[PDB]
């Protein structure tokens, strides 16, 4: 059907409002689901306003006819999930709810390639960013003080359900021959919580 | 007590077929229809159809008509959903679900119980087991690099599950060569290095491999 | 001129009945077209039982020798929006079904084409100015994928795929 907004951020204790519109007068035959990363959708509201057994009182829903509302009265950090409305076989596109919190600086770690991987002819260089906020960060790979771009891939975790932070990994993949032709390997991080960029480096063969 | 246990992950060739099972327990199987819903990676939910376990009748979404077959086995209270002519856009997690009575009758589609979902990948690439390399380390970080496997997923544990706090298993990235790769890291007190042994347990069911990898400092 | 239903076992001629109604299932999902598809019911004996329009003949898919409506075709459903709810059809004029004793039953094709037109006209009152298409049973167990009925101490199974294959505007 239709859902508004498509995504929203809110602080712990905030009021969250999600709206779903139907095309036809379905009376109150509306359901609402919460889907946390990595698991099946979970029914929270049925019949537009009824709460599923065991659901905390901060969840509620209202509406009738075509216009319906889903409300989290006081947002908790474990409420980060995508919320779907549903009427009969038709699911709404979902509203993704995440949490804004205080700025947290990233702790940076760099990992050289293991000698075991060098036997296969490939070298992976890993840069870890652990428990930061906001999500926006920039990781630059520098090899012999030369900016590398196009040979690295990043992966970010879903926002942590306790402290509402993120973790990021960036992996630089080079050939073994290309790896032994340079000395200094470094990843420099730029983040809102860092007054100056942080560079973690190592020398090959140390 | 009610649970729906579905079949494991699977990879199938484009144009072929896949059959997903879902075994029920904790209730009378014939009292509730079985629904099937899929979810493409990072996308919404899509209902494909239901089956009446008393009569075998079905009602598919027109989008899947003449392409999907739903059957059941009451003696083991299992429902099956076979999807043929698979295309790249059939890559999804396939869920079985049943409703919970509404108390008042407005919940004929309120799926209160879901299975864990079955990830079906549609590609021509060969199933490939992962290689496991250590990411060697008052806080210290260490982890395991799980590279070059196909399809998804890979599950990661640390110290057989005794280590969970500080554990970050990253989503897998598809590399340029068409194989998957991920990392799982953990932050531990630097004083514990050398005293506490750290082992990451990698599991990749599609290739039926288990790796127990102890990460040591240099 | 007639529509033929393959049955097993062979119903004798005194098993000939009057079709007084039937029970349907509306196909779900997005349509990507201005059409609505109906098939014989995907339900079971409870959908038939809640119809309350049968007489003294135990049958699936079609109701035989039941009670007819008084003015025109009447269609009843718990929730029209719910595809998991069967659509019960009560006819105002009965349609003869005759079985020859050789293994097949026959229904007039002009009479049945008149009856589906009345049904499709009634469904468009509930679903709008859309094309009404009836298709065969989606599948299931023998006594429900076929029009099955009891007659004289014996249970017969008749395929009905020829009764549900038309498009109406
Ligand atoms: C059908 O109904 C008509 C009208 O009562 C009746 O004359 C006829 O015998 C019935 N046919 C059967 C086969 O019962
Ligand atoms: C329907 O009624 C006619 C006449 O009353 C009877 O001969 C016939 O056997 C009935 N049909 C069935 C299936 O019993």
Residue numbers in the entry:
A (entry chain L): 4 to 106, 111 to 213
B (entry chain H): 1 to 52, 52A, 53 to 82, 82A, 82B, 82C, 83 to 100, 100A, ...
C (entry chain C): 1 to 169
Lines quoted from the article behind this entry:
Here, we report on structural characterization of vaccine-elicited VRC01-class bnAb precursors in the IAVI G001 Phase 1 clinical trial with the eOD-GT8 60mer nanoparticle as immunogen. The engineered outer domain (eOD) germline-targeting version 8 (eOD-GT8), which was designed to activate VRC01-class germline-precursor B cells specific for the CD4bs on HIV Env, exemplifies this strategy. VRC01-class B cell receptors are defined by their specificity for the CD4bs and by using heavy chains derived from variable (V) gene alleles IGHV1–2*02 or *04 paired with light chains containing a five-amino-acid LCDR3 (4, 5, 32, 33). High-resolution X-ray structures of eOD-GT8 monomer complexed with Fabs of five VRC01-class bnAb precursors with >90% germline identity revealed a conserved mode of binding to the HIV CD4-binding site (CD4bs) via IGHV1–2-encoded heavy chains, mirroring mature bnAb interactions.
Two versions of eOD-GT8 were used: eOD-GT8-mingly, which represents a minimal glycan variant of the antigen used in the trial, and eOD-GT8-mingly-N276, which includes the conserved N276 glycan so as to evaluate its accommodation by the VRC01-class bnAb precursors. The five antibodies retain over 91% and 97% germline identity in the heavy and kappa chain variable regions (VH and VK), and converge on a shared epitope centered around the CD4bs, similar to VRC01-class bnAbs. Notably, all five antibodies block the CD4bs by forming beta-sheet interactions with the CD4 binding loop through heavy-chain complementarity-determining region 2 (HCDR2), a key characteristic of VRC01-class bnAbs. Despite differences in V gene usage, the light chain consistently contributes to the stabilization of the antigen-antibody complex by providing additional contacts that enhance binding without dominating the interaction. BSA analyses reveal that LCDR1 and LCDR3 interact with the D loop and V5 loop of the antigen, with 2 to 3 hydrogen bonds typically forming between LCDR3 and these loops. Despite variability in light-chain V gene usage, the LCDR3 sequence consistently converges to a conserved motif as previously reported, coinciding with the QQYEX sequence found in the crystal structures.
